[PDB]
Amino acid sequence: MFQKQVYRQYTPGFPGDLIEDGPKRARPGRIMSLSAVNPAATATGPNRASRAFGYAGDVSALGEGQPKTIAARASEVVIGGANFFGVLGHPKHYALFGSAGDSLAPSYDLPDGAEGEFFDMATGLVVEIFNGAAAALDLDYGDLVAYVPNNLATADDALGLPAGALVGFKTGSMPTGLVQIPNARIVNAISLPAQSAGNLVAGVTIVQLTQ
Amino acid sequence: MFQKQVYRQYTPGFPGDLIEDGPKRARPGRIMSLSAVNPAATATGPNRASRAFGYAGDVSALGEGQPKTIAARASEVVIGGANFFGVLGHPKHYALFGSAGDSLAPSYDLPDGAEGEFFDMATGLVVEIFNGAAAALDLDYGDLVAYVPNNLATADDALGLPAGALVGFKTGSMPTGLVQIPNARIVNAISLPAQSAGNLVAGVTIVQLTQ
Amino acid sequence: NFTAPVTTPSIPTPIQFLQTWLPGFVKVMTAARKIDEIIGIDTVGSWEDQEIV
């Protein structure tokens, strides 16, 4: 648990944290359970920080009868649905809850119905990027980013990519079934090794310019 | 050259200076010489201010042994470029550095290996604009802009143009070989005379909305 | 068989010295404003107003 080896320098940052200061836009939202999707989800995954989220429906009605009171403006989201809403972030805002076994355990996900922060514009954000080609890749400054859809077909997803994982790609070639995030760039440059089904490398964390 | 004429009012501003305050994004970088470009540069020019720059590579490794020290995040750029990395500005930040014939001479050039500030988002930026097609052009409020690449073909570059000059064009018609800066508008109307090879009119200073 | 010099030959004296700088700066002239000299000025209204009657 404690430190066992000393490194030369500290890490630049942690996923889901703002790393540059500038213009930014964010909105709150409530998370739908993935099983609540009507046509069923071909790709599944937990509500993990630094994943793209999609708009689901308006939940400002706040009532069960014919007359209702619009008390506040609220939106509700799903883990990987279309109609991109934002990217989860700001891990320091939430509570730990531990894990299923015992408390005081490392946890980086969120339960269903929790309130989260979703970024639509950000000068710099630390996120996790996956590889969608099963080959060695380097991203460089100008590459684009896309995220796995909720209903990505199994034929189009040979690898076991999660529901809302972020994927980087070159401006020329893009995976067939992914959904692109407009006006998004990969400011930092890293390299990724070869991938295979059941052996997905997590992908080194990167910095993103969402809008 | 001393004031030989008295006017009723001062000039609105100078190229490379911010003219309006608002949302803004800028990053630092280091300059690469054109000689280091592997496929050789067909279009050449100096590292002049108020001109586009392109991404070259990452120089954050800072070491040669097995354990490296990544103590900073840095990037390096080229004057022509194909991966857009903002526009050089803020002349008050730098120094004269002297000129070939004699020092203490007016110039916007910057030596190789120097550090500059490149703007990606700017509410108002005074720049030096050029004209294409060697014909009289009127820009008006809402035209677009593009910049010359390093690898522009000599067939598409009949008029001798600098490596990273900014060129404005109408929505319908654009010169054959150019790279368009996304989401940029002229904002300030301007008129430019007819041109010829070797006698290109420098244009007039103009406000810009980079993003 | 000249011995290779350690330092590259060059003109010794830099141009920063042997220079003389005049004391001050010169500013652009622009035009004159003489509207007040003709009819004067009267502070009668208030900012954030619209009309005078």
From TrEMBL, chains A, B:
<dbReference type="InterPro" id="IPR054438">
    <property type="entry name" value="Struct_cement_gp24/gp6"/>
</dbReference>
<protein>
    <recommendedName>
        <fullName>Virion protein</fullName>
    </recommendedName>
</protein>
<dbReference type="Pfam" id="PF22758">
    <property type="entry name" value="Phage_cement"/>
</dbReference>
Automatic annotation (TrEMBL), chain C:
<protein>
    <recommendedName>
        <fullName>Capsid and scaffold protein</fullName>
    </recommendedName>
</protein>
